[PDB]
Amino acid sequence: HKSEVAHRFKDLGEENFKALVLIAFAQYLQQCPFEDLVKMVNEVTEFAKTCVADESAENCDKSLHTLFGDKLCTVATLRETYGEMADCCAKQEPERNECFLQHKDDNPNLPRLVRPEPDVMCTAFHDNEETFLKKYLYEIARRHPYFYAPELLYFAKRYKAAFTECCQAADKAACLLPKLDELREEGKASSAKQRHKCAILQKFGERAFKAWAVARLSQRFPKAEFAEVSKLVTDLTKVHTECCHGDLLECADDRADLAKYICENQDSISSKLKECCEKPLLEKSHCIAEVENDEMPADLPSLAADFIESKDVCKNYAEAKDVFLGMFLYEYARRHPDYSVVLLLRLAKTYETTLEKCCAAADPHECYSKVFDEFKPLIEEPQNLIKQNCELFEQLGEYKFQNALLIRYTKKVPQVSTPTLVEVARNLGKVGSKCCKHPEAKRMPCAEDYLSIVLNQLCVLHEKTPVSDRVTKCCTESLVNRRPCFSALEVDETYVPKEFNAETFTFHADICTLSEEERQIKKQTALVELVKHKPKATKEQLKAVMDDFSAFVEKCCKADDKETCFAEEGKKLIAASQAALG
Ligand SMILES: CC(=O)C[C@H](c1ccccc1)c1c(O)c2ccccc2oc1=O
Ligand SMILES: CCCCCCCCCCCCCC(=O)O
Ligand SMILES: CCCCCCCCCCCCCC(=O)O
Numbered sequence: 115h116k117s118e119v120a121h122r123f124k125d126l127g128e129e130n131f132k133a134l135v136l137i138a139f140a141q142y143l144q145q146c147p148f149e150d151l152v153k154m155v156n157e158v159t160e161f162a163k164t165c166v167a168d169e170s171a172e173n174c175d176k177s178l179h180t181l182f183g184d185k186l187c188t189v190a191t192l193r194e195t196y197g198e199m200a201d202c203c204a205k206q207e208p209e210r211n212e213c214f215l216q217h218k219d220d221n222p223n224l225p226r227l228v229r230p231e232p233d234v235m236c237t238a239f240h241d242n243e244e245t246f247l248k249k250y251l252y253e254i255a256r257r258h259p260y261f262y263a264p265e266l267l268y269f270a271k272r273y274k275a276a277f278t279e280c281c282q283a284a285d286k287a288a289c290l291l292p293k294l295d296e297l298r299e300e301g302k303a304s305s306a307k308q309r310h311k312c313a314i315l316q317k318f319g320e321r322a323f324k325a326w327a328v329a330r331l332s333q334r335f336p337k338a339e340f341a342e343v344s345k346l347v348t349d350l351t352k353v354h355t356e357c358c359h360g361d362l363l364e365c366a367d368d369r370a371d372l373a374k375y376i377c378e379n380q381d382s383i384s385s386k387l388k389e390c391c392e393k394p395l396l397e398k399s400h401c402i403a404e405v406e407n408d409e410m411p412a413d414l415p416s417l418a419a420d421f422i423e424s425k426d427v428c429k430n431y432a433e434a435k436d437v438f439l440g441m442f443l444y445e446y447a448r449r450h451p452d453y454s455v456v457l458l459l460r461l462a463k464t465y466e467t468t469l470e471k472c473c474a475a476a477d478p479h480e481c482y483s484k485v486f487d488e489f490k491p492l493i494e495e496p497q498n499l500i501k502q503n504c505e506l507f508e509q510l511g512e513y514k515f516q517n518a519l520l521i522r523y524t525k526k527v528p529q530v531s532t533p534t535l536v537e538v539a540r541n542l543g544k545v546g547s548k549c550c551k552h553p554e555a556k557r558m559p560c561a562e563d564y565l566s567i568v569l570n571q572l573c574v575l576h577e578k579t580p581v582s583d584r585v586t587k588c589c590t591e592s593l594v595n596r597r598p599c600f601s602a603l604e605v606d607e608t609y610v611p612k613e614f615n616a617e618t619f620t621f622h623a624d625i626c627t628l629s630e631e632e633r634q635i636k637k638q639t640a641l642v643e644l645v646k647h648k649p650k651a652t653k654e655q656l657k658a659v660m661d662d663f664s665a666f667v668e669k670c671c672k673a674d675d676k677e678t679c680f681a682e683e684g685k686k687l688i689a690a691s692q693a694a695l696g
């Protein structure tokens with residue numbers, strides 16, 4: 115208890131310490147140059163080593179909050195660069211750290227991070243490994259100031275491994291670009307999934323978040339007793355509140371406490387944690403969050419005894435409605451690791467609605483008896499959408515699946531900008547690639563994890579620049595209704611076709627040389643524009659026009675005179691297409 119900074123140095127070790135301190139300063143000091151933060155991290159590291167040698171030395175006795183805040187207040191250009199943030203230095207703890215948190219900028223004005231050429235990256239990696247890796251760690255942390263530093267650190271070690279492996283290969287590019295791409299997607303998805311959990315907490319409140327956490331922990335930890343899940347759900351909520359406010363030291367400490375609690379009580383929680391509970395303090399929390407679902411106990415009774423068929427259902431409910439509803443959710447969820455969390459919550463809200471209505475009626479048991487009937491169609495709707503979409507994904511490419519989604523979603527919401535329709539259809543295509551490789555036992559949770567992210571992204575974007583009442587309705591819907599609401603969108607009956615623009619459907623020989631990704635984006639853009647222009651086109655008409663386009667590109671990219679034929683065969687393509695459509 116003597117030196118917080120000594121204790122975290124000894125626990126983390128110097129290399130992790132230095133990294134996290136760099137991430138933390140970069141999350142706060144987003145416009146400070148790399149060399150200035152490196153010098154702060156080395157001074158903080160020197161000071162922490164005085165506390166490691168003497169837990170009683172000067173200032174070693176201070177809160178990490180206090181030490182962190184004082185270091186920020188030694189920044190010479192604090193007022194010049196960050197303006198009103200420098201006024202936090204005029205306060206004392208805990209007001210100062212509160213004031214610093216109040217001034218973390220969610221979207222700094224920083225240019226997109228452009229990935230250098232593989233050979234350039236590998237020369238840089240070989241020439242100064244430490245500086246190469248620390249600099250991009252800085253670039254990411256300063257652009258992602260709420261991304262949990264220990265997890266940003268876990269990604270950085272995977273990036274290091276990819277460089278170490280691939281800067282061996284003869285084709286550096288063919289090894290490295292696929293590992294970097296997958297790491298980036300997992301990075302972005304991890305950050306999204308955190309933002310989703312903060313939106314549940316922040317937009318729907320503590321009850322909705324705790325319902326969400328009971329279901330998810332009950333699927334993960336099915337041998338856990340309900341009181342043990344209730345306890346974990348309380349602690350989860352404080353971790354997420356702090357993490358959501360973006361207070362790294364408070365969040366880190368609530369996580370370490372919960373990760374120590376879980377590891378002291380494995381036999382009450384899960385047989386899947388032995389691995390995770392061997393790992394250092396730094397990762398242990400993170401390993402737990404990733405653990406595989408435990409096998410559920412054999413010989414579980416059906417839910418009907420307690421929830422459905424018992425005398426005492428209305429009595430037990432009315433005593434403590436949230437506690438009984440929480441029990442139902444735990445019993446349902448621990449039996450159905452194959453259900454989405456949201457599906458389980460839709461069932462618990464149906465059960466709740468039933469008991470509200472049935473417990474007031476003449477024959478309560480007559481009324482609440484039939485409830486499992488209303489559950490079947492709730493379960494079947496997401497299972498059938500997944501079946502139908504994965505069948506379509508299997509029939510078509512990943513790429514032609516995307517094109518099918520672009521036609522579908524453009525006809526439903528043609529007021530959405532082209533670039534966004536292309537990025538939503540392309541991301542949805544990627545959810546089909548990822549989750550259709552699961553067996554149906556694991557599809558619904560996969561689809562939930564990745565669709566909720568796409569839908570949060572879409573709703574954030576739409577809140578900033580709204581274009582459709584129907585999307586506002588779906589985005590402001592209840593947590594359980596959002597995805598069904600988007601699923602219920604029909605073809606827009608009222609949309610005014612977009613006016614013909616020859617420029618939009620004119621191609622050049624440039625298309626032949628473009629990268630695959632970029633060629634696919636140029637064609638998917640034109641397909642959206644075709645649909646905004648001919649929204650009544652049938653799947654036969656659009657398919658006819660797209661195959662003529664495809665024959666036209668295959669003809670014109672192999673022609674003696676590329677440009678002439680792109681121009682002349684282009685005018686014919688446009689004319690035939692207009693006549694055939696609308
Ligand atoms: C996506 C996973 O469900 C993460 C999980 C969780 C579950 C429900 C709501 C929030 C988060 C999760 C944690 O984030 C966690 C963090 C620290 C310590 C233990 C944890 O256990 C966990 O299951
Ligand atoms: C201690 C945990 C008690 C949890 C309360 C369970 C209530 C489940 C009812 C369904 C409400 C789901 C929340 C939502 O509307 O998003
Ligand atoms: C399989 C990905 C292709 C994209 C669109 C298909 C969406 C299927 C909806 C699945 C819903 C699961 C979560 C829920 O219970 O609402």
Ligand SMILES: CCCCCCCCCCCCCC(=O)O
Pocket residue numbers: 499523524526527530538569572585597600601602
């Ligand atoms: C402006 C975005 C396009 C509108 C569609 C939003 C994305 C679809 C999300 C729901 C998809 C679930 C599968 C479905 O039922 O189509």
Ligand SMILES: CCCCCCCCCCCCCC(=O)O
Pocket residue numbers: 619637638640641644659660661663664687688691692
């Ligand atoms: C009315 C103007 C008509 C012009 C042609 C429209 C072009 C849209 C084509 C997109 C089809 C891509 C399929 C493929 O990959 O080959």
